[PDB]
């Protein structure tokens, strides 16, 4: 970039996708953000108020502050030899609930359910077997792999 304004070099970054223009939906308004929640900081191009800086687009952080119309997010930013915990202030339209701990939460819930079943004496689900093991292979149809003259005749255009 030739100048270093606040929104320099955001022509494609702060643009809406094809046929996906418009203001944020009601589902975004009705989302409940709590302090301590993991959120994704994704700028909505059509809001332009409370917009994050381009650096924080696509960053996931933890909410440290909720105001009537804004969200306080802590983002890690590497500066030289250390990482800084940057606190940014954005409107709720530029914030999304982050599924970064979805699999870990599911693992915890599955472990709790497994413990409950083991206490109740219910039969646990069968353990999956490794697909890397050996065995007999019975080929239903066997074909010959070879290079033909027709392959060369085809790869030549015109």
């Amino acid at each position: 970039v030739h100048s270093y304004g606040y929104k320099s070099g955001t022509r494609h970054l702060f643009a809406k996708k094809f046929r996906k223009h418009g203001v944020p939906s009601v589902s975004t308004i009705l989302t409940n953000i709590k302090v301590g929640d993991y959120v994704d900081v994704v700028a909505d191009s059509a809001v332009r108020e409370g917009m994050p800086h381009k650096y924080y687009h696509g960053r996931t952080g933890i909410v440290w502050n909720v105001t009537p119309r804004g969200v306080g997010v802590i983002i890690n930013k590497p500066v030289r030899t250390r990482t800084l915990r940057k606190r940014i202030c954005v409107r709720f339209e530029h914030v999304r609930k982050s599924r970064c701990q979805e699999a870990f939460k599911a693992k915890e819930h599955q472990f709790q359910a497994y413990l409950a079943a083991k206490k109740a004496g219910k039969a646990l689900p069968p353990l999956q077997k490794s697909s890397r093991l050996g065995g007999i292979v019975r080929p239903k149809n066997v074909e010959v792999l070879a290079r033909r003259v027709a392959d060369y005749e085809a790869m030549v255009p015109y």
């Binding site: 944020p24 009601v26 009705l30 409940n32 709590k34 909720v66 009537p68 709720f92």
Partner: protein, 282 residues
């Protein structure tokens, strides 16, 4: 030819259809987004809208909570339920709007269990008293949702609002749009508003139309019944009393008509038969 076709293939490729309810001309999404909006510091505490919709024949009043899966209607009142209380005609006038708002407020307060705690105005005066809101136990609060209706001085949406306010619910409002409010003087005439609420305008128009009839589309069903212009106010007063007495009452209480869809195989078979017939011709 000679005129460029605007709606060409590229035009349809690049078209972004609006939301279904916007393309149906039903919902103002800017207004809806501002109305369902709440402080993020509330963390999603319940917020209600007083949805007022008026058709050519009925008045629909609902108490609605916004949700991501879809709005939840807590309580609904209808103008066509008024005959159960004594309103046999004019279910779309200002008096019917006030009665529908009163009925919705009474039903909502009964369902929430706070009916005995909040009585509202027993006798309507048309007068404005400011609602008590957070911004002694506070009344149940809903905000008015007029949709796409034109908010003029004396519209029936504000009749429903006034009925709900007198029913016990606390809907934040100012009297600037009640009938009889004087824009120039910045004052409200409670007598004119009460006259509208009890439909003395309807009674006066009925008297005038009947006098002209003696000298018949208008008031045809009013005149078919033996409705007197001097009995309308008492009728609406009795309706108010009955609605307060028991809001839970209403009006006294699968052949397939769809056309089956052809499968893709049937469509292709029909198309092939048609092209084969054309080939046989030529």
């Amino acid at each position: 030819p000679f005129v460029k076709v605007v709606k060409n293939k590229a035009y349809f490729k690049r078209f972004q259809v609006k939301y279904r309810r916007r393309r149906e001309g039903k919902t103002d999404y800017h207004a809806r987004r501002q109305m369902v909006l709440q402080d993020k510091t509330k963390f999603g505490s319940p917020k209600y809208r007083l949805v007022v919709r008026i058709t050519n024949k009925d008045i629909i009043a609902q108490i609605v909570q916004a949700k991501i899966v879809g709005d939840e209607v807590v309580m609904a009142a209808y103008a066509h339920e008024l005959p159960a209380f004594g309103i046999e005609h004019g279910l779309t006038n200002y008096a019917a709007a006030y009665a529908t708002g009163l009925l919705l407020a009474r039903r909502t307060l009964a369902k929430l269990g706070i009916a005995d705690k909040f009585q509202g105005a027993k006798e309507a005066d048309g007068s404005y008293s400011a609602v008590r809101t957070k911004k002694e136990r506070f009344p149940f609060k809903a905000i008015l949702d007029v949709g796409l209706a034109r908010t003029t001085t004396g519209a029936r949406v504000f009749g429903v609002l006034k009925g709900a306010v007198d029913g016990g619910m606390a809907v934040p409002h100012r009297p600037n749009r009640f009938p009889g409010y004087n824009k120039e003087k910045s004052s409200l005439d409670a007598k004119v508003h009460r006259d509208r609420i009890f439909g003395k305008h309807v009674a006066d128009y009925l008297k005038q139309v009947k006098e002209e009839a003696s000298s018949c589309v208008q008031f045809s069903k009013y005149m078919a019944a033996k409705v007197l212009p001097e009995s309308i106010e008492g009728m609406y007063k009795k309706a108010h009393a009955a609605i307060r007495a028991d809001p839970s009452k209403s009006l006294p209480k699968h052949k397939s008509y769809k056309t089956k869809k052809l499968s893709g195989a049937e469509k292709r078979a029909a198309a092939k038969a048609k092209v084969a017939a054309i080939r046989e011709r030529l």
